[PDB]
Structure formats: C-alpha cells, structure tokens
C-alpha cells in the first residue's frame with residue numbers, strides 16, 4: 001500500500017541518482033524476475049502520481065522517471081519478454097496465464113486511470129508522449145465488456161486536449177498512433193473513435209485553411225505564421241497513419257510551397273511540413289489507385305499531381321535553409337524510387353503512365369546535394385546529425401543501384417571523397433595496429 005510506495009520512490013531514486021542503469025527498460029528488465037509483484041503494483045504508481053502529499057512531495061524529474069518506469073513495466077507485463085536489445089523459447093502455461101491476467105489488470109486499470117494521468121500532466125510533453133505509449137498494450141475489447149464506454153470518451157477528451165495544446169512532433173505522433181490503435185482494432189468502438197477523430201481533423205482543417213488564406217492574402221504577421229505552422233504540424237503528424245485525402249490538403253500545401261519558391265520568404269518549418277504533408281497525400285493517393293481499378297483519367301490526374309510536386313521538391317533544393325534541402329532531397333530519393341519502373345511490378349502494368357525518369361538537370365542536382373551536404377568539412381547533436389546524413393546517402397544510394405541517376409558520375413564523387421583512404425589507408429592501418 002504505502003510499503004510498496006516507499007520501495008518505488010526509492011527505486012525511482014536509485015535509477016536517477018546512480019548511473020548504474022542508463023536505460024529504464026533495462027533496469028526494469030533486470031529486476032523483473034525478483035521484483036515482478038512490486039513492479040506491477042500499478043495502483044501504487046498511479047496513486048503516487050495522482051495524489052497530493054501529506055510528508056515529502058515528488059520532484060518533477062522523479063515524477064517523469066516514475067512514468068517512464070511505469071510504461072516499461074506495462075510493456076514487459078503485456079509482452080512477457082525482455083525489451084529490445086536484451087532478448088534471445090516458449091511461454092510456460094503459468095507465464096502465459098500471468099500475461100493474460102496482467103493484460104486484463106493493466107487494461108482495466110489504465111482505461112480508468114490513463115485519462116486522469118493525462119489530465120494532470122497535460123502540458124508536460126515528454127510525460128504525455130510517454131503516457132500515450134500505454135494504449136497500444138490495452139485489451140481494447142474491454143472498452144465494451146466493462147461497459148467502459150464512459151472512459152473511452154474520457155481518453156478521447158484528453159487526447160483532444162493534448163493535440164489542441166501541443167506542437168511537439170513526439171506528442172502529436174503519439175496522439176495519431178493512439179487514435180490508430182483505438183480505431184482499427186475493435187468494431188464496437190471503431191464507429192465512436194472515427195467520429196471523434198474525424199471531428200478533430202475537421203476543426204484543424206478549417207483552422208489550417210482559414211490560416212492558409214490569412215498568410216497568402218497577406219507583410220505577414222507572426223500570428224499568421226504560427227497559425228499556419230501550428231495547425232499544419234498537427235495535420236502532417238496525423239496524415240502519415242490516417243488517410244486525410246477527402247480534405248484536399250495537397251492544394252494548400254502546394255500554395256505555401258509555390259509562394260515560398262516565388263517570393264522566397266516562407267519560414268523553413270512551414271516549408272518542411274508542407275513538403276512532408278503533400279508527400280503523405282501523394283502516397284495515400286497512390287494507395288487508393290493501386291487497390292482500386294483506376295481509369296485512364298485517374299492515372300493522368302495523379303500523374304500531373306506527382307509531376308507538379310517533383311518539380312516543387314527540385315526547386316526546394318535551392319532553398320537557403322538546409323533543413324528544407326534535406327527534406328526536399330529525402331522526398332526526391334523516396335519518390336523517384338516509388339514512381340520508378342518498380343511500380344510496374346506484380347502485374348500492375350496499368351500504372352505505366354505514373355512512371356517517372358528524372359531528367360539530367362535533376363540528376364545533377366541530386367549529385368550536388370550529396371557533395372554539399374552529405375560530404376561536409378565540419379556533443380550529442382553530432383552523433384545524431386551523422387546518422388541523418390548517413391540516411392540521406394543511403395536513400396540516394398538506392399537511386400544509383402537502379403540507374404535512376406547517373407551511376408558513373410556518382411561513383412566519381414565517391415572516388416574523390418575516399419581518396420585519402422585509397423592513397424594512405426594501408427600505411428595508417430598498419431601504424432595504428434602497432435600502438
């Protein structure tokens with residue numbers, strides 16, 4: 001009750017204060033055999049999180065740490081295996097039984113308690129994002145079984161509050177994925193969630209559209225810019241896992257990107273998001289066309305869309321802001337692979353009119369970026385920025401392998417940059433081998 005409450009408070013302290021466990025998931029995993037009973041006292045945890053003190057309060061950091069530990073215990077309980085990077089087998093009868101029992105407990109519990117947790121910590125993005133990892137583990141059918149419809153409403157109310165209050169890409173993506181899990185994985189609740197999710201979108205599409213018009217008709221305000229970006233961010237987040245094509249979003253993103261090209265003065269984040277959103281619209285347009293039996297004119301309308309967007313991403317290579325370039329590049333190396341001749345695989349030869357070969361000028365520019373932005377002269381931010389450039393190359397690399405860009409002019413650049421390995425590598429190798 002409060003005995004487990006002391007232990008858990010001290011366990012949060014031992015995690016934070018000692019750098020003996022760096023990963024929460026690993027700490028939990030390590031203790032799991034010995035301290036399962038304690039680590040699945042979820043009523044204790046939510047209590048510690050939700051109650052007000054008598055004495056000694058929790059500090060903001062330790063609350064955060066508790067939530068993270070809690071989410072890790074939930075996973076391990078639900079999944080019944082160690083986390084990614086500690087894995088290795090059959091569940092025994094009793095282990096399976098415990099898994100079903102634990103899943104039931106945490107679902108009933110968290111259905112009721114997750115809306116409350118989200119309410120209290122609604123503005124703490126890192127906490128909210130961490131809490132919204134929880135529904136993926138629920139036994140969704142219990143939203144019907146328990147006559148628990150009141151708490152699904154409750155959750156959806158809070159998810160609405162979160163998206164409405166936040167712009168962080170983690171928070172938003174966490175929300176999107178959550179609607180995703182509540183939607184498609186039970187018919188009973190599907191109709192209810194779809195109604196709440198579609199009403200949410202609507203409110204933002206209207207705000208976005210009004211804001212798009214505000215900005216473009218306009219001397220443009222900081223408000224105008226915050227409204228366009230803020231709303232767009234929400235929609236782009238969702239547009240990855242939700243098919244928002246019924247709202248013609250591609251049109252207003254295209255206006256923001258063309259205005260930015262013409263007059264040069266569109267904020268980098270609006271441009272980056274507008275690109276990402278348009279891209280997501282396009283992929284979803286494709287999915288509807290693959291799966292349906294499309295006519296000639298369907299294909300020809302999608303083609304014109306794609307040609308007009310590849311034109312835009314090309315032009316965006318020349319944007320001063322290097323995040324735009326990277327995004328534009330990323331999308332080019334995505335799209336030119338997608339609308340390659342691969343598109344006519346699996347008896348899909350109807351799609352020929354959608355195939356695109358990038359011209360010489362575009363291949364030259366897709367070489368240019370690599371010379372300028374993968375291969376550059378000159379803590380935690382640099383190990384991250386490296387893996388990005390690594391991905392930018394790996395995405396370019398696919399175009400080389402299938403002769404979509406000039407495979408010889410590419411390799412020439414790879415020569416030029418590997419020169420010091422070919423000229424002095426052996427000598428540097430053997431030298432370091434004797435020290």
Ligand SMILES: O=C(CC1CCCCC1)Nn1cnnc1
Pocket residue numbers: 167226229230233269
């Ligand atoms: O947060 C905003 C507006 C917001 C729009 C959605 C995400 C980008 C930023 N502005 N800002 C204030 N101080 N620095 C930037």
